Write a protein that binds this ligand. Structure first.
Ligand SMILES: [Mg+2]
Ligand SMILES: [Mg+2]
Ligand SMILES: [Mg+2]
Ligand SMILES: [Mg+2]
Ligand SMILES: [Mg+2]
Ligand SMILES: [Mg+2]
Ligand SMILES: [Mg+2]
Ligand SMILES: [Mg+2]
Ligand SMILES: [Mg+2]
Ligand SMILES: [Mg+2]
Ligand SMILES: [Mg+2]
Ligand SMILES: [Mg+2]
Ligand SMILES: [Mg+2]
Ligand SMILES: [Mg+2]
Ligand SMILES: [Mg+2]
Ligand SMILES: [Mg+2]
Ligand SMILES: [Mg+2]
Ligand SMILES: [Mg+2]
Ligand SMILES: [Mg+2]
Ligand SMILES: [Mg+2]
Ligand SMILES: [Mg+2]
Ligand SMILES: [Mg+2]
Ligand SMILES: [Mg+2]
Ligand SMILES: [Mg+2]
Ligand SMILES: [Mg+2]
Ligand SMILES: [Mg+2]
Ligand SMILES: [Mg+2]
Ligand SMILES: [Mg+2]
Ligand SMILES: [Mg+2]
Ligand SMILES: [Mg+2]
Ligand SMILES: [Mg+2]
Ligand SMILES: [Mg+2]
Ligand SMILES: [Mg+2]
Ligand SMILES: [Mg+2]
Ligand SMILES: [Mg+2]
Ligand SMILES: [Mg+2]
Ligand SMILES: [Mg+2]
Ligand SMILES: [Mg+2]
Ligand SMILES: [Mg+2]
Ligand SMILES: [Mg+2]
Ligand SMILES: [Mg+2]
Lengths: 121, 205, 157, 82, 80, 129
RNA sequence: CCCGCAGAAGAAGCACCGGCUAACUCCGUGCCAGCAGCCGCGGUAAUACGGAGGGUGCAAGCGUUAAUCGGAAUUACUGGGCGUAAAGCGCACGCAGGCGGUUUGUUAAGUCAGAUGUGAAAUCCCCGGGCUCAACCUGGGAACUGCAUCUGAUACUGGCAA
RNA sequence: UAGCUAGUAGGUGGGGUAACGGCUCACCUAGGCGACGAUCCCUAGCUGGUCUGAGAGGAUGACCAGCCACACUGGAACUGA
């Protein structure tokens, strides 16, 4: 406040950072993948949540949650990664896309199959 | 483009008669009207402020046979134009060719009038027109060509127009199946039931 | 000429030696549709008992409001507690574009077309007192002409 | 070289030529000093079709500017007294 | 008439040359407040006529060094 | 140290009306009389004087129609820290034309209504609701 | 573009359905498997998980992801604050800087008022014209909130004055 | 990122440029820029506009159009208005 004070030092706009460093306004990004493993989540949930240490094409190393019941990933395997935090596992801020490249679709999913990359019967 | 499904189901959801399954028969009373939208029709809706606005828009859509992408563009046109935004919406919906052909009597239902327009039967100012969404300006002369004139899906449907209200703004000859769109449609003439106020709200946010 | 409606219903706790005992807090508004508005809070053990209790307070607590045809005279702030609030007269076209709770108190009053935004907090109880703070404070040229000992045409024209 | 010529605007298969005074080096729809009406070859016997401001042509041609093959025909079309 | 931007002298230690700080009281685009802003120039003069701390009229002219594309018309209200 | 006297004049009016008081004395000036003569001629203040020859003192006599005060609200606009000047068309109409903005124009201080008919603009001194 | 020819003939998905937000039950599983934009659902009667029927909204598109503004008066000039929520330097003196009591001059810098040329064309907004209609195209006008100079007004701001 | 700058800043004279000018040599003079941000560092073609917003702004500058810059990297001149 105080108008002369703002002439001498203008309003510094609050630069809200992007949650996902997949970078360059990218929709998705490839990853060669390492260490497909499992982790127990925060307090109120309790389960064994699937996850893989993805090694992105642009140099970064991330953890991606693998959705659905059952998956194809093991150690390596080239996978497409989208954005989307889980709000359960602390730090896992990406989602492994199913159908795309080597992560195939989940078996027998009739309802909701754009997510999870499954075709018609 | 169109609904192409169970038509009389849509009348039960809203409740009021949408003139979908009208035809040669006058009144339905053959569907358990009002109290059976789906399976759980014994249930009664609480209905919020978003609901009442949405159900009004959904009703006015299904009466005229318009989809939301096309409907949203009709709203934007009404916002540009002068006067009351609510009365302009209904003026543009009534100005469609398939709707004017239905009001003339050349088509027992609105889906019949829509297909009758589409199949090169309807002529207007000497020009053949295939578009339902053709915006009919005032002082026109819609008519049927001699190929489709006096066939067995028009003379039967034209007898229903005797029973109908018959709007003031248009005239029909009913001799050589000729029509004359005289002036634009006013609010006070038609409707007298469906609400314009609630639809203007929904899109303003 | 009744015209009455519910804005919100909020459930509140007491907490006693035993456990905790819930009571519902309604909030109704009433108005003739011609410059008479009243809100009534009301609170009871049951929900339908609360709104019927709430409607009795609102009927007795009416406030007179002057207005031009079917809209406000001039733009008006109406601060109360947290909700600062704002509303502008607008033209014969358009409809009542305002927030929930803030629109209820408008539409039942008599106004048919205004702009309005609820700055600060937007608590259903305070925004109703905010609008009615503004609408009670608002004044017509017939008031102001007599107030300044002059004339209605000379001030306006 | 300043030249009075057609610019070619409009949609695919439905052209609309903005007759315009520009330098020859400059592109078809490039810079110009100012326009001088328009041409449309798909009007038919109706109200409007072609325009050409005769006063501005007397300014530019009187100073020094060429008239292209099509615009030469439009000055013949409007006529002097016919 | 011809151009004549007024301005106050800052220094003269240059030989047939001067530095003038023109004053202009333009407002801020955003905030609306009228700020006391400077337009600092150099100006030509036949001999070191003007000294320091005085108002001066200045004309836009031919370039006559690198920078210094302004000519002194005359002095108004000379130094104390 | 009393930087703006015009703001201070308007506070004595504002805090005068809240207090329910008839007489409100203060130091006078050229501009204080020019503002006061607009407010009397329109109708917020029933009469005023500028007694004291050598060392002037301006006292106002404030208006109350009901028990409620006549001056609803009164605000300095073109304050000395941030001056405001407006064009012919851009002169603000307070309370949609039942409330006045005192404006210092080239042809003396006057109301915003008078500045339209005069055909000019200037420094908007203060709003008066 | 027009005419005829044959004949229901060739031509519908995919999200979601606990609240925010329009839309419900039944089986399967039992803090497991899984969902999710926030709150959160699952511990043997799940409207939130998986399937099933029904429904809702979109429909030749629909969702998901990313990206920008918006809502955010959550960088606030219009339009926020600073006793206790984040926020008064530990307290003075003071240079540049900002701001300045009051009266009479002049003054044309701010200021305002007008005038002139410029503010490329498209784009935008208003009314027309043309593709069967619309996108799309296009005619005219306003608009181009400005900018520079010129001539005034001289209350308020500033200079030099008394 | 707090001091930078030696043809650096200005003169007189000669040369050079289509043209003025440290454009460039020759003295002469020790100034010029800087808290109304020089220097240094990072990032970036700019504008008409576009998107968004009630507006003030905020973001942006694909496509259509004006200007600049570049043509395997670094450099140079020649021929020509
Ligand atoms: Mg479509
Ligand atoms: Mg609550
Ligand atoms: Mg509660
Ligand atoms: Mg081209
Ligand atoms: Mg040629
Ligand atoms: Mg200016
Ligand atoms: Mg130079
Ligand atoms: Mg789901
Ligand atoms: Mg079960
Ligand atoms: Mg589900
Ligand atoms: Mg904001
Ligand atoms: Mg705050
Ligand atoms: Mg506060
Ligand atoms: Mg504390
Ligand atoms: Mg604290
Ligand atoms: Mg302290
Ligand atoms: Mg400090
Ligand atoms: Mg201190
Ligand atoms: Mg001190
Ligand atoms: Mg000081
Ligand atoms: Mg000063
Ligand atoms: Mg003073
Ligand atoms: Mg003079
Ligand atoms: Mg002007
Ligand atoms: Mg130019
Ligand atoms: Mg333009
Ligand atoms: Mg347009
Ligand atoms: Mg145009
Ligand atoms: Mg044009
Ligand atoms: Mg023209
Ligand atoms: Mg300017
Ligand atoms: Mg200027
Ligand atoms: Mg004179
Ligand atoms: Mg004078
Ligand atoms: Mg003075
Ligand atoms: Mg020096
Ligand atoms: Mg906003
Ligand atoms: Mg490209
Ligand atoms: Mg250049
Ligand atoms: Mg080269
Ligand atoms: Mg050569």
């Amino acid at each position: 406040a105080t108008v002369n004070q703002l002439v001498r030092k203008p309003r510094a706009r609050k630069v809200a950072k992007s949650n996902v460093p997949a970078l360059e306004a990218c929709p998705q990004k490839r990853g060669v993948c390492t260490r497909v493993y499992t982790t127990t989540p925060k307090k109120p949930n309790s389960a064994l949540r699937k996850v893989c240490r993805v090694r992105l094409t642009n140099g970064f190393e991330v953890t991606s949650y693998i959705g659905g019941e059952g998956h194809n990933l093991q150690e390596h395997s080239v996978i497409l990664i989208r954005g989307g935090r889980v709000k359960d596992l602390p730090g896992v801020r990406y989602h492994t896309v199913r159908g795309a490249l080597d992560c195939s679709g989940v078996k027998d999913r009739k309802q909701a199959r754009s997510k999870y990359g499954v075709k018609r019967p | 483009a169109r609904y192409l499904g169970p038509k009389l189901k849509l009348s039960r959801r809203e409740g009021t008669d949408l003139f979908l399954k009208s035809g040669v028969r006058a009144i339905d009373t053959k569907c358990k009207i009002e109290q059976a939208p789906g399976q759980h029709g014994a249930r009664k809706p609480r209905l919020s402020d978003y609901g009442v606005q949405l159900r009004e828009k959904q009703k006015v859509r299904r009466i005229y046979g318009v989809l939301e992408r096309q409907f949203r563009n009709y709203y934007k046109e009404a916002a540009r134009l002068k006067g009351n935004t609510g009365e302009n919406l209904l003026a543009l919906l009534e100005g469609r060719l398939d709707n004017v052909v239905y009001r003339m009597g050349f088509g027992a239902t609105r889906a019949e009038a829509r297909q009758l327009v589409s199949h090169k039967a309807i002529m207007v100012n000497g020009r053949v027109v295939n578009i339902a969404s053709y915006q009919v300006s005032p002082n026109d002369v819609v008519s049927i060509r001699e190929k489709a004139k006096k066939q067995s899906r028009v003379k039967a449907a034209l007898e229903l127009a005797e029973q109908r209200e018959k709007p003031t703004w248009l005239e029909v000859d009913a001799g050589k199946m000729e029509g004359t769109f005289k002036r634009k449609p006013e609010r006070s003439d038609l409707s007298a039931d469906i609400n314009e106020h609630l639809i203007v709200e929904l899109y303003s946010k | 000429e009744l015209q009455e409606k519910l804005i919100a219903v909020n459930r509140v706790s007491k907490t006693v030696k035993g456990g905790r005992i819930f009571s519902f807090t309604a909030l109704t508004v009433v108005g003739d549709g011609n410059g008479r508005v009243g809100f009534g809070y009301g609170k009871a053990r049951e929900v339908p008992a609360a709104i019927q209790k709430a409607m009795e307070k609102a009927r007795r607590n009416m406030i007179n409001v002057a207005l031009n045809n079917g809209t406000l005279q001039h733009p008006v702030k109406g601060v109360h507690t947290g909700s600062r609030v704002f509303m502008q007269p607008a033209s014969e076209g358009t409809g009542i574009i305002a927030g929930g709770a803030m629109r209820a108190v408008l539409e039942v009053a008599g106004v048919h077309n205004v702009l309005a935004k609820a700055y600060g907090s937007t608590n259903p109880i305070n925004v109703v007192r905010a609008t009615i703070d503004g609408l009670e404070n608002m004044n017509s040229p017939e008031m102001v002409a007599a107030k300044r000992g002059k004339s209605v045409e000379e001030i306006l024209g | 070289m300043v030249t009075i010529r057609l610019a070619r605007h409009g949609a695919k298969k439905r052209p609309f030529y903005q007759v315009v005074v520009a330098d020859s080096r400059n592109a078809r729809n490039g810079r110009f000093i100012e326009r001088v009406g328009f041409f449309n070859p798909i009007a038919s016997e109706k109200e409007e079709g072609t325009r050409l401001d005769l006063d501005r042509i007397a300014h530019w041609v009187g100073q020094g500017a060429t008239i292209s093959d099509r615009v030469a025909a439009l000055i013949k079309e409007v006529n002097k007294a016919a | 008439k011809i151009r004549t931007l007024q301005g106050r002298v800052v220094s003269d230690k240059m030989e047939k040359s001067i530095v003038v700080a023109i004053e202009r009281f333009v407002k801020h685009p955003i905030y609306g407040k009228f700020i006391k802003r400077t337009t600092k120039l150099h100006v030509h003069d036949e001999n070191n006529e003007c000294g320091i701390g005085d108002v001066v009229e200045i004309r836009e002219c031919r370039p006559l060094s690198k920078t210094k594309s302004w000519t002194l018309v005359r002095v108004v209200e000379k130094a104390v | 140290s009393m930087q703006d006297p015009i703001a201070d004049m308007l506070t004595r009016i504002r805090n005068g009306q809240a207090a329910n008081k008839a007489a409100v004395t203060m130091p006078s000036s050229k501009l204080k009389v020019a503002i006061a003569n607009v407010l009397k001629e329109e109708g917020f203040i029933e009469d005023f004087k500028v007694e004291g020859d050598t060392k002037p003192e301006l006292e106002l006599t404030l208006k109350y129609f009901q028990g409620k005060a006549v001056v609803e609200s009164i605000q300095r606009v073109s304050r000395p820290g941030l001056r405001i000047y407006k064009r012919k068309d851009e002169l603000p109409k307070v309370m949609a034309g039942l409330g006045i903005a005192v404006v210092s124009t080239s042809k003396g201080v006057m109301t915003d209504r008078a500045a339209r008919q005069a055909g000019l603009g200037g420094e908007i001194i203060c709003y008066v609701a």
